[PDB]
Amino acid sequence: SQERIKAERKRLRNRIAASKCRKRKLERISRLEEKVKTLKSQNTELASTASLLREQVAQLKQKVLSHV
Amino acid sequence: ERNKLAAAKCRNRRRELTDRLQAETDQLEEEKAELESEIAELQKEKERLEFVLVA
Ligand SMILES: [Cl-]
Ligand SMILES: [Cl-]
Ligand SMILES: [Cl-]
Ligand code: NA
Ligand code: NA
Ligand code: NA
Numbered sequence: 174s175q176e177r178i179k180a181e182r183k184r185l186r187n188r189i190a191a192s193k194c195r196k197r198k199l200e201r202i203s204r205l206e207e208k209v210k211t212l213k214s215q216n217t218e219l220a221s222t223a224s225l226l227r228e229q230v231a232q233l234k235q236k237v238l239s240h241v
Numbered sequence: 242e243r244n245k246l247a248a249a250k251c252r253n254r255r256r257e258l259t260d261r262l263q264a265e266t267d268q269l270e271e272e273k274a275e276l277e278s279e280i281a282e283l284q285k286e287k288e289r290l291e292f293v294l295v296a
Contacts, residue, residue: 194251198259205262212269219276226283233290240296 190247190251194247194254197251198255202259202262205259205266209262209265209269212266212273216269216273216276219273219280223276223279223283226280226287230283230286230290233287233294237290237293
């Protein structure tokens, strides 16, 4: 009759806490997925630039050797 | 008082997906740094070879 309303307040506080937890977690996950996507893109570009540079260094070294 | 317990329980429940994403993020950061360093080295080498060639 009066202890019960306090216990209902505690229950509601628990459900609220759990909801806020779930939200914070979902925002965190979403953010992490965005960061993983961005990093994948960047590393793709960088990997391309590195590959092209390796090709160019190979050609150059071949030329240098041709003059030995 | 109760917030520390609630946040602690919160960080523990179903932390496999968030841990996996965080780990993948770490790996991608490392790979990125390594690629940037490799590009720096490759550019220096390219310049030195272009320097040897003018002869
Ligand atoms: Cl409730
Ligand atoms: Cl989290
Ligand atoms: Cl979501
Ligand atoms: Na590489
Ligand atoms: Na190559
Ligand atoms: Na770096």
